Chain A
Amino acid sequence: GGMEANKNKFIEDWGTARENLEFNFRWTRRNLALVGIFGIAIPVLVYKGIVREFHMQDEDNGRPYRKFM
């Protein structure tokens, strides 16, 4: 039956603006800082911590530290 939602123009515009955020990127200072912190620095720190955990396991086992990329 006639079950279609009563579409609101402003709600639809909000949805389209949300799904079209790729046009609004401008490499501003905030965007650059966020990319450099949460896109590079945090993954690098996580990788270093994981490698450190593996190397600590190697030291406790007495083996020779493993080789990672």
Chain B
Amino acid sequence: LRFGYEVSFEALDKGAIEILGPYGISYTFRRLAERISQLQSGFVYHYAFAMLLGLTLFVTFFCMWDSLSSWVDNRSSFILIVSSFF
């Protein structure tokens, strides 16, 4: 009887499964969407800056790709991106 509520339901069904399922996913996606929406600050300077970073990243990672690939790894680049995203 204790397993029915203390473990199966509260600790698993309403616990780890839900915390790592719809609940935590909902909270993380809410905060991530909010943070993404913070980028659209309504500033022409911010938009021009985003354009400039886009152009510079494209140039660096495609035109200079020989030296860039000789130096950095794709795994390391994506890991740094994710770490920046926390």
Binding site for B on A (CB under 8 A): 21-22, 24-25, 27, 30-31, 34-35, 38-39
B16 proximity list for chain A (CB < 8 A):
25, 31, 35, 39
Q: Give the Cβ gap from B83 to chain A, nearest Cβ, in Å.
A: 23
A31 proximity list for chain B (CB < 8 A):
11, 15-16
What are 14 A-B pairs with beta-carbon distances under 8 A? A21-B9, A22-B14, A22-B15, A22-B18, A22-B19, A24-B10, A25-B15, A25-B16, A27-B19, A34-B7, A35-B15, A35-B16, A38-B7, A38-B8
Majority secondary structure, A binding face: helix
A22 proximity list for chain B (CB < 8 A):
14-15, 18-19, 23
Q: Please report the total number of B residues contacting A with Cβ < 8 Å.
A: 14
A21 proximity list for chain B (CB < 8 A):
9-10, 14-15
A24 proximity list for chain B (CB < 8 A):
10
Contact of B11 with A35 in the complex, beta carbons under 8 Å: yes
Q: Top 6 closest A-B pairs, CB basis?
A: A21-B14, A34-B11, A35-B16, A22-B18, A25-B15, A22-B14
